[PDB]
Coordinates of C-alpha atoms and ligand atoms in Angstrom, one line a residue:
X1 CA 24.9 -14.8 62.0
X2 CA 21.6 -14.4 60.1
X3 CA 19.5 -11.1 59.4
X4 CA 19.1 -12.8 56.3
X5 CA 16.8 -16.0 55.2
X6 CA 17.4 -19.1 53.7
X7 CA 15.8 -21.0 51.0
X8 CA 16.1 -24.5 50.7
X9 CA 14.7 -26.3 47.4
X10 CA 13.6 -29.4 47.5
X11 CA 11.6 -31.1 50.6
X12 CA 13.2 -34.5 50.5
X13 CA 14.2 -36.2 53.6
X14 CA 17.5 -33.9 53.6
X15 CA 16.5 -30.2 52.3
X16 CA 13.8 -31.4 55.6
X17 CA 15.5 -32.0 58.0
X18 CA 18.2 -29.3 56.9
X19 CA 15.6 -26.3 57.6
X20 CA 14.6 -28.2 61.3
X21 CA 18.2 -27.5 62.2
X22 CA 18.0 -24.1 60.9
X23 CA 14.8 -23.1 62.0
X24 CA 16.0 -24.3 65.6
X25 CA 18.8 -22.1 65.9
X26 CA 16.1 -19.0 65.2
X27 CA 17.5 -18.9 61.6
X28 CA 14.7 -17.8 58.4
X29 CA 14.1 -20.6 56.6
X30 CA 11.7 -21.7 53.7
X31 CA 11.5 -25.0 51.4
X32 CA 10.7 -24.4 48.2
X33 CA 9.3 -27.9 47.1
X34 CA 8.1 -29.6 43.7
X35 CA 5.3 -31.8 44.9
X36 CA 1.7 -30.2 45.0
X37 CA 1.5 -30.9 48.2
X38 CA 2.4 -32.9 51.5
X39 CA -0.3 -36.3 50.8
X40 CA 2.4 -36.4 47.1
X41 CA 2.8 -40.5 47.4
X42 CA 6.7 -40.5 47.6
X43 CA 7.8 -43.6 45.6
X44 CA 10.4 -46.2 46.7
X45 CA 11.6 -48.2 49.4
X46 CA 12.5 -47.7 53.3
X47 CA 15.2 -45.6 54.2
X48 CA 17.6 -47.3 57.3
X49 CA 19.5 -44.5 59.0
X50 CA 22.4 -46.1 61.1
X51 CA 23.6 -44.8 64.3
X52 CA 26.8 -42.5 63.8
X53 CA 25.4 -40.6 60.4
X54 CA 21.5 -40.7 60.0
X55 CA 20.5 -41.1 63.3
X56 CA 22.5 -38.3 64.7
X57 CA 20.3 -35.7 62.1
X58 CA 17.1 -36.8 63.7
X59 CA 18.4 -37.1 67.9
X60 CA 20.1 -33.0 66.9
X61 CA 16.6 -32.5 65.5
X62 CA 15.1 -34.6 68.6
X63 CA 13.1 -37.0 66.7
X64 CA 15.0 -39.7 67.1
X65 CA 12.2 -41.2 69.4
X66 CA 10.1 -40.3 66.7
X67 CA 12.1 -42.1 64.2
X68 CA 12.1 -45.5 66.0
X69 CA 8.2 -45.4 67.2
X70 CA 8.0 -45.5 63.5
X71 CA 10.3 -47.4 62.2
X72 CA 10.3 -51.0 61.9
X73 CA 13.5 -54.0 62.3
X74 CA 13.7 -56.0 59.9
X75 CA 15.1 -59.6 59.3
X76 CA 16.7 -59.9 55.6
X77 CA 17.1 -63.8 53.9
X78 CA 19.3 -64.6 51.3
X79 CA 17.7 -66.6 48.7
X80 CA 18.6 -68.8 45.4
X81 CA 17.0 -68.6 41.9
X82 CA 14.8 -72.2 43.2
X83 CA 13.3 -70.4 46.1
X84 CA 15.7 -72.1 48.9
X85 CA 16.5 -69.7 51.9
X86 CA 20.8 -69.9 52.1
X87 CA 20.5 -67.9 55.2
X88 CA 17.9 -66.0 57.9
X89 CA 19.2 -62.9 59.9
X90 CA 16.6 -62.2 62.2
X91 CA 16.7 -59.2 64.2
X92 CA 18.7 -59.6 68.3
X93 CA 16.8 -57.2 70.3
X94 CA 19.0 -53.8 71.1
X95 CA 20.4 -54.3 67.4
X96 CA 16.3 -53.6 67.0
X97 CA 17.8 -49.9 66.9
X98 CA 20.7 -50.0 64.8
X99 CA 18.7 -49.4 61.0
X100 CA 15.0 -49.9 61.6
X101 CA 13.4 -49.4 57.9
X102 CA 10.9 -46.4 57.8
X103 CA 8.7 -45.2 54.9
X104 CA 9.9 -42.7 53.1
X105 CA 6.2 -41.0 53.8
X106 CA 6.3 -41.4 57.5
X107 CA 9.9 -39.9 57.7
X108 CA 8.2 -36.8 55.8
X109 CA 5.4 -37.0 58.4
X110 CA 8.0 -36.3 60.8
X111 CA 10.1 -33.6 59.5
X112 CA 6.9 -31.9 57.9
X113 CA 5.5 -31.5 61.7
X114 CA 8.6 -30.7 63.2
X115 CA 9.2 -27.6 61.3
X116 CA 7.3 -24.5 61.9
X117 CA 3.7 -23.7 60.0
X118 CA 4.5 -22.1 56.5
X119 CA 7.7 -23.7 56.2
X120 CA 7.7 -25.2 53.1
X121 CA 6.0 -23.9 50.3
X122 CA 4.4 -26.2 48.3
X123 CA 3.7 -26.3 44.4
X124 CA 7.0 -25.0 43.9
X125 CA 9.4 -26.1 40.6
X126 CA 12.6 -24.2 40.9
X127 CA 13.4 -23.5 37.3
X128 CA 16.1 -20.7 37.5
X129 CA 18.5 -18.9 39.8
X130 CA 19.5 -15.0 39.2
X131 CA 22.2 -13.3 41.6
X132 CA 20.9 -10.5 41.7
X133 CA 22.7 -7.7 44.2
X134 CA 23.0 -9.0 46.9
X135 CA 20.3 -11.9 47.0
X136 CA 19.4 -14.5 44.8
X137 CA 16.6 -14.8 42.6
X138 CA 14.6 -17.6 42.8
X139 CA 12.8 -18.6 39.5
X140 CA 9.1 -20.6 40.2
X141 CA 7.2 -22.3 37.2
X142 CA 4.0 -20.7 36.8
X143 CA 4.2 -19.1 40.5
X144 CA 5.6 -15.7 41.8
X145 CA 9.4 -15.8 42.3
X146 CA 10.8 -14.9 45.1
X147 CA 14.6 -13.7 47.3
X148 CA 17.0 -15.2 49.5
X149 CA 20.4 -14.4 51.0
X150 CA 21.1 -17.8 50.8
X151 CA 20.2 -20.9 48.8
X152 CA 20.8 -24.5 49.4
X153 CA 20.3 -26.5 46.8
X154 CA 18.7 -30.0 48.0
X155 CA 16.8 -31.0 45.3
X156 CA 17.6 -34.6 44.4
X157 CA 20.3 -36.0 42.4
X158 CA 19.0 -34.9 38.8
X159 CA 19.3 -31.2 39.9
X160 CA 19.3 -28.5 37.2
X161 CA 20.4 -25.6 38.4
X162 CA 23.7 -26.7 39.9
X163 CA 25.5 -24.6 37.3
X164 CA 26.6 -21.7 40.1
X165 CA 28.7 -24.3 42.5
X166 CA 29.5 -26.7 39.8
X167 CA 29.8 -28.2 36.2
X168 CA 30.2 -31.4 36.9
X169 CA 27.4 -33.5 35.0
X170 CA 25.7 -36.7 36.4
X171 CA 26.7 -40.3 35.2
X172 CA 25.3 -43.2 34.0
X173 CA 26.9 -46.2 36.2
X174 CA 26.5 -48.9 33.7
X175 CA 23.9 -51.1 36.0
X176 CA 20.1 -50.1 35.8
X177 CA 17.2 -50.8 38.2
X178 CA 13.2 -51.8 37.6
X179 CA 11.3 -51.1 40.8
X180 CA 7.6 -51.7 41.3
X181 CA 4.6 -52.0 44.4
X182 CA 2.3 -54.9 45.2
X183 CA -0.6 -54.1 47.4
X184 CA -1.9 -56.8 49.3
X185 CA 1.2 -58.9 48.4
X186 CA -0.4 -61.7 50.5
X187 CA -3.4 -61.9 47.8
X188 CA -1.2 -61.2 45.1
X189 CA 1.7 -63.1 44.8
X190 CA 1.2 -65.3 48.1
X191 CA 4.2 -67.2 46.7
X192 CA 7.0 -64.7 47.0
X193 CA 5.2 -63.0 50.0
X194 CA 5.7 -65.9 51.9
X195 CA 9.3 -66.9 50.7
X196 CA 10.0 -63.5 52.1
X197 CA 8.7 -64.5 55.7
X198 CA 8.5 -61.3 57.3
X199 CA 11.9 -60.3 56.2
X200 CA 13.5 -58.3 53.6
X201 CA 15.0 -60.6 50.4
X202 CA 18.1 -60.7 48.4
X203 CA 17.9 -63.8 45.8
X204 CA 21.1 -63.2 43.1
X205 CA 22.0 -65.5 39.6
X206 CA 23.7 -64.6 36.7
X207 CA 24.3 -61.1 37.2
X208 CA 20.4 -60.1 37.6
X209 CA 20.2 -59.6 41.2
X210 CA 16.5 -59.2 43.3
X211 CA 15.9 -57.2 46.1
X212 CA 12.4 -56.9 48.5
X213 CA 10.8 -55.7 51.5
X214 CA 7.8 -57.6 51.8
X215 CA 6.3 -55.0 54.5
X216 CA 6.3 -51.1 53.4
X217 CA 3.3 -50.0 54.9
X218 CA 1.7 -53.1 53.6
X219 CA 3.5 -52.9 50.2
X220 CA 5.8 -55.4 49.0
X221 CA 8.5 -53.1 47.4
X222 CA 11.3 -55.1 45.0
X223 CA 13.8 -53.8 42.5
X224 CA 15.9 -56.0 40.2
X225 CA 19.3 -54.6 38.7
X226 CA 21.3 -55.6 36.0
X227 CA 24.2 -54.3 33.9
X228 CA 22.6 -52.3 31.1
X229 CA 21.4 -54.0 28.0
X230 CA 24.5 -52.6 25.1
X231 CA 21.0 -52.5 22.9
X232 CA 20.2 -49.7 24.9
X233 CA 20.8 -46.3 23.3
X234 CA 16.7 -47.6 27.1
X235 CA 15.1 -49.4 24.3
X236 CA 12.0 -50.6 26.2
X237 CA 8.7 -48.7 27.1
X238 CA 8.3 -48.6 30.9
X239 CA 5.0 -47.1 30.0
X240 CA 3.8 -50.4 28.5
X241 CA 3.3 -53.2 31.3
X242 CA 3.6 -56.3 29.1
X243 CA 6.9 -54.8 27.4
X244 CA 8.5 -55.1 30.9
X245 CA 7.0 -58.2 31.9
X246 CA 8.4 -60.0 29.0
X247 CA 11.4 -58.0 28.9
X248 CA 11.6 -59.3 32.6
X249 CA 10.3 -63.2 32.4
X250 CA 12.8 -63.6 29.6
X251 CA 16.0 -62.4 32.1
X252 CA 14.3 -64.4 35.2
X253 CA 13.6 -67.8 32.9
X254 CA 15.6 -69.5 34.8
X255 CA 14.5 -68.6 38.3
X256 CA 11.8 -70.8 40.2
X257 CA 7.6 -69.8 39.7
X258 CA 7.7 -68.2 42.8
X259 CA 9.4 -64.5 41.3
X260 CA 7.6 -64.9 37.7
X261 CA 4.6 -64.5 40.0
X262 CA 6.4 -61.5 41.4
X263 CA 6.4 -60.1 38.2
X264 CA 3.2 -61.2 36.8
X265 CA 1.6 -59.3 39.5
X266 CA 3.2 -56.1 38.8
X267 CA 0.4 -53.6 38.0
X268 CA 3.4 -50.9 36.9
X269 CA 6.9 -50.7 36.9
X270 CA 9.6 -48.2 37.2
X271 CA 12.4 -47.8 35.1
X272 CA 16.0 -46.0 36.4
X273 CA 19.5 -46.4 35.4
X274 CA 21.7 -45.7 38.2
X275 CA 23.5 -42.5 38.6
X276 CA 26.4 -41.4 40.2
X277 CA 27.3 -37.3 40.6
X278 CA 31.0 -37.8 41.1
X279 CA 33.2 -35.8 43.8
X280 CA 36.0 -35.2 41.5
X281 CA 37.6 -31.9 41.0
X282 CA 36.6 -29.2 44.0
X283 CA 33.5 -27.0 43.6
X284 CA 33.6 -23.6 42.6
X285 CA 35.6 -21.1 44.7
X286 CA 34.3 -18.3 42.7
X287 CA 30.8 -17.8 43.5
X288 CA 28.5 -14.5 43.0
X289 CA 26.5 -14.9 46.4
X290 CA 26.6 -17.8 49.0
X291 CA 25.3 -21.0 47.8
X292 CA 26.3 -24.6 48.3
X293 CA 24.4 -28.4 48.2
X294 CA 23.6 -31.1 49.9
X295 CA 21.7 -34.4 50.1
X296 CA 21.8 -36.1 46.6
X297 CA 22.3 -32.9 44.6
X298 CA 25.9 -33.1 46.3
X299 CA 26.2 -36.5 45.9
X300 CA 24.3 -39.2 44.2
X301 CA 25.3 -42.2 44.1
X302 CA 24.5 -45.6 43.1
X303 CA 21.9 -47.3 46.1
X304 CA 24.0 -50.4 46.8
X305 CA 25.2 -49.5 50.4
X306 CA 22.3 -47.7 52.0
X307 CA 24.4 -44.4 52.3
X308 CA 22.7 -41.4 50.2
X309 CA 20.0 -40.2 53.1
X310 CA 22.7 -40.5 55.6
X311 CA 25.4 -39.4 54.4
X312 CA 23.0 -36.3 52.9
X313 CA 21.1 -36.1 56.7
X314 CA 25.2 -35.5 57.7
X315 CA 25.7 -32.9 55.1
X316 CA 22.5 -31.1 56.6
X317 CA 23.9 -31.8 60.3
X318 CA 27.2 -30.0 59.6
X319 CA 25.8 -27.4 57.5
X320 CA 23.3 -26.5 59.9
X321 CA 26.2 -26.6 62.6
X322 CA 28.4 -24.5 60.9
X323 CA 25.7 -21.7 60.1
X324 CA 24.9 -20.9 63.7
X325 CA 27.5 -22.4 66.4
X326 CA 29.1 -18.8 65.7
X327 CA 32.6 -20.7 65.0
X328 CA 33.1 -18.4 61.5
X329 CA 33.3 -14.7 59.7
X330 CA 31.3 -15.3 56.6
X331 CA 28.9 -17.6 55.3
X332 CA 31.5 -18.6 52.7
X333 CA 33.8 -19.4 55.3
X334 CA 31.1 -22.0 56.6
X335 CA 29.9 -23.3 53.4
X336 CA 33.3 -24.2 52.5
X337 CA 33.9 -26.2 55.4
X338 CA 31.2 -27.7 55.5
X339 CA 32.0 -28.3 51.5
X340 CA 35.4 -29.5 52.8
X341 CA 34.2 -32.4 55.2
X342 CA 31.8 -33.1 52.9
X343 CA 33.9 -34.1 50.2
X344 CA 35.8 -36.8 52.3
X345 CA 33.3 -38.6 53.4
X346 CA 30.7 -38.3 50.4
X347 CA 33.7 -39.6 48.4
X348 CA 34.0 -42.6 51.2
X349 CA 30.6 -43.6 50.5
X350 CA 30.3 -42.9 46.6
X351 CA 33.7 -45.1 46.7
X352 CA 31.4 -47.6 48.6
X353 CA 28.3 -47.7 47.0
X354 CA 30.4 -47.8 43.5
X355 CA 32.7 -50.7 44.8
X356 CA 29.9 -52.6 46.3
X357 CA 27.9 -52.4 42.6
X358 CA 31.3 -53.8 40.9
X359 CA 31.2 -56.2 43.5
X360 CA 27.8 -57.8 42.4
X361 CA 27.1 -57.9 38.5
X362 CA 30.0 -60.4 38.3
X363 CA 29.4 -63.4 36.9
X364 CA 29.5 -65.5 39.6
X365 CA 28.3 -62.9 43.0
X366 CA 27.8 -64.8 46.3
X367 CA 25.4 -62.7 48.8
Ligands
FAD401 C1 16.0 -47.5 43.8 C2 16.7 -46.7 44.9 C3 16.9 -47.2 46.2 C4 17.5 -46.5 47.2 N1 17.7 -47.0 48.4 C5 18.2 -46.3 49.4 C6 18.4 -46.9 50.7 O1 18.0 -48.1 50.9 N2 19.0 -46.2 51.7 C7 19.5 -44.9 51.5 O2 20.0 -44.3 52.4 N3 19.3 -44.4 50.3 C8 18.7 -45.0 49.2 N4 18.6 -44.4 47.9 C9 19.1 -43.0 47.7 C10 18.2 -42.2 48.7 O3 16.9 -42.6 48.5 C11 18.4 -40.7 48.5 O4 19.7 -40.3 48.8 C12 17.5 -39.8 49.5 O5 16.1 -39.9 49.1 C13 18.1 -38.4 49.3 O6 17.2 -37.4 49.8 P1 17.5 -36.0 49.1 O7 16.5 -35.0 49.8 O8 18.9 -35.6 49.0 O9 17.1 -36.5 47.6 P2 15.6 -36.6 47.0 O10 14.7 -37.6 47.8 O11 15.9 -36.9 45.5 O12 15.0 -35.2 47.1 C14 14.0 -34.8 46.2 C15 13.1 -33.7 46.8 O13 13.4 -32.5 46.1 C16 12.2 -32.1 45.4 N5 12.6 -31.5 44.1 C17 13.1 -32.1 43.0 N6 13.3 -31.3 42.0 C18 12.8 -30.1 42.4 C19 12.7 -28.8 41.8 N7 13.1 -28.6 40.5 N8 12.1 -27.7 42.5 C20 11.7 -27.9 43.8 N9 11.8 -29.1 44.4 C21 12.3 -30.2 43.8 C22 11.5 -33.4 45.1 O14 10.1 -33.1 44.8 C23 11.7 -34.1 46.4 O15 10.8 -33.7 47.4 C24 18.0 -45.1 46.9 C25 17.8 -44.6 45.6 C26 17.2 -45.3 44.7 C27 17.0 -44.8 43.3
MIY402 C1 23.6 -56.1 50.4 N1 24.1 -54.7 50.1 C2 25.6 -54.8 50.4 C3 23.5 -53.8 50.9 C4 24.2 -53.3 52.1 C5 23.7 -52.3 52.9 C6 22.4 -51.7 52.7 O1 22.0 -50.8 53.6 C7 21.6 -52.1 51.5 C8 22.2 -53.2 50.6 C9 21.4 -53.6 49.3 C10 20.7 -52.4 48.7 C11 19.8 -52.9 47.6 C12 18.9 -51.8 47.0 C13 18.1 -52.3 45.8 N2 18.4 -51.5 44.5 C14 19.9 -51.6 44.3 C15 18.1 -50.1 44.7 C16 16.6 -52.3 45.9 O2 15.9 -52.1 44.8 C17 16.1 -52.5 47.1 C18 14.7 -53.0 47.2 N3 14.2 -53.3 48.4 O3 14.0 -53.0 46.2 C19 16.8 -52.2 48.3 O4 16.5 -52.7 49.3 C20 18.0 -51.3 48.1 O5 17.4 -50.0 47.7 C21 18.7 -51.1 49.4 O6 18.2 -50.2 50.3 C22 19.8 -51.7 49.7 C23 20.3 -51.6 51.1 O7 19.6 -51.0 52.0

């Protein structure tokens, strides 16, 4: 059911994989992302998708294969504040396949190729959306704007033109997370690299907890979190290095050489208070043309139960279902069922991931 196109905003690893599943049931599809282009460095850690959610996006997109050859098992330790490993969970072969970590670069890789050429238009900031008669009007910074039928909005949790399907605000959470690289962590803090062993880390005291894969494309990648400072409106520059560093060797005085190294050897660090875009009342039923969300934009929610790409590469899975298997009369019809099943599960996992952060932060959190 598509004489009509379909513009997607936002080339994450949902809005992605959402115009593969289009685009392979012969629907028009284009993805209207920020980034100048596809070499953008993407930020962050390794995205796990589990069997069930995530993994079934990429085998209906057939790239599961793909997925794996890239991927990469990892082990994860449990550590204390002195450096002592409380516990190794290597990787059993055949549970090899059950989250293998991939870069969130290499996943793009792999969507990026799968789609058709001309898919996703690059250089493209989505600052406004018109319904115009009976297409929308999509508003590009500094580019020519351009028409679609329908619009899916997948374009990250901080999303600012979710004003046509809802008026629901983001959150703060109340925790906040510092996140930085290491190249050659081996040369560069050979202390915590080698703590790590090969497999991810999880070291927690007094309510400051330490995450860290010490192999991301040859990155160490770590985030700390922490309750917010009250002090803070965030009342330190994340611009200036040594504000962090100090901020940071003053909260981890306590803990063995080993991390200050970690944090010595930080070049730059991110700042980021988590967020949470919270499923409560229902969506708008009223709406001018067909639009709906998913990925983050429908869902954000705080990263302490590795749903958020899975749960949004399901939202693109049923979607994508739904607007082709035939099954419906209208496009509104399919949006809001796929807006229906959405909302159970999303809520599962935002009640998850916000359980699981009450769950640590305590004052005295075992791992
Ligand atoms: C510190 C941290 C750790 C996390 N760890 C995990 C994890 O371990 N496992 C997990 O599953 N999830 C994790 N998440 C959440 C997860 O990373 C996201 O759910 C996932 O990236 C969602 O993909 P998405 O496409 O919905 O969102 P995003 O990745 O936010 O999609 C953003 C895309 O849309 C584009 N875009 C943004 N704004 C515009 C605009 N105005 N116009 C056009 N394009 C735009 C961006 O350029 C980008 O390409 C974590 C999040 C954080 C902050
Ligand atoms: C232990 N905790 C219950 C879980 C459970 C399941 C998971 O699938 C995960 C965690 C920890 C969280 C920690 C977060 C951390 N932070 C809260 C964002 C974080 O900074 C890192 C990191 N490597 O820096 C993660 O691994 C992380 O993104 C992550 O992917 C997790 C993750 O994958």
């Amino acid at each position: 059911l598509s004489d009509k196109n379909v513009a997607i905003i936002g080339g994450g690893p949902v809005g992605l994989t959402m115009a593969k599943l289009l685009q392979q049931n012969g629907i028009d599809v284009s993805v209207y992302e920020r980034d100048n282009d596809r070499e953008a460095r993407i930020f962050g850690g390794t995205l796990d998708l589990h069997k069930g959610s995530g993994q079934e996006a990429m085998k209906k997109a057939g790239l599961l294969q793909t997925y794996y050859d890239l991927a990469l098992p990892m082990g994860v330790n449990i550590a204390d504040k002195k450096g002592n490993i409380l516990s190794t969970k290597n990787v059993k072969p055949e549970n090899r396949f059950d989250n293998p970590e991939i870069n969130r670069n290499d996943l793009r890789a792999i969507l990026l190729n799968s789609l058709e050429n001309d898919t996703v238009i690059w250089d493209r900031k989505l600052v406004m959306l018109e319904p115009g008669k009976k297409k929308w009007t999509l508003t590009f910074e500094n580019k020519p704007s351009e028409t679609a039928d329908l619009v899916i909005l997948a374009n990250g949790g901080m999303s600012k033109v979710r004003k046509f399907v809802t008026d629901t605000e983001v959150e703060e959470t109340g925790t906040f997370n510092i996140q930085a690289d290491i190249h050659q962590p081996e040369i560069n803090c050979p202390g915590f690299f080698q703590l790590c062993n090969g497999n991810r880390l999880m070291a927690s005291h007094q309510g400051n907890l330490l995450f860290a894969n010490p192999n991301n494309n040859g990155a160490l990648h770590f985030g700390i979190s922490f309750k917010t400072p009250d002090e803070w409106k965030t009342q330190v520059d994340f611009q200036n290095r040594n504000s962090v560093v100090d901020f940071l060797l003053k909260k981890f005085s306590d803990w063995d050489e080993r991390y200050k190294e970690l944090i010595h050897a930080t070049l730059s660090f991110v700042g980021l208070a988590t967020r949470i875009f919270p499923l409560e009342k229902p969506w708008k039923s009223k709406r001018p043309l067909p639009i709906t969300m998913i990925g983050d934009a429908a869902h954000l929610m705080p990263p302490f139960a590795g749903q958020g790409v899975n749960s949004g590469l399901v939202d693109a899975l049923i979607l994508s279902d739904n607007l082709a298997d035939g099954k419906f009369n209208s496009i509104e019809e399919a949006v809001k069922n796929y807006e229906q099943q959405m909302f159970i599960y999303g809520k599962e996992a935002q009640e998850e991931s916000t359980q699981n952060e009450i769950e640590m932060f305590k004052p005295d959190f075992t791992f």
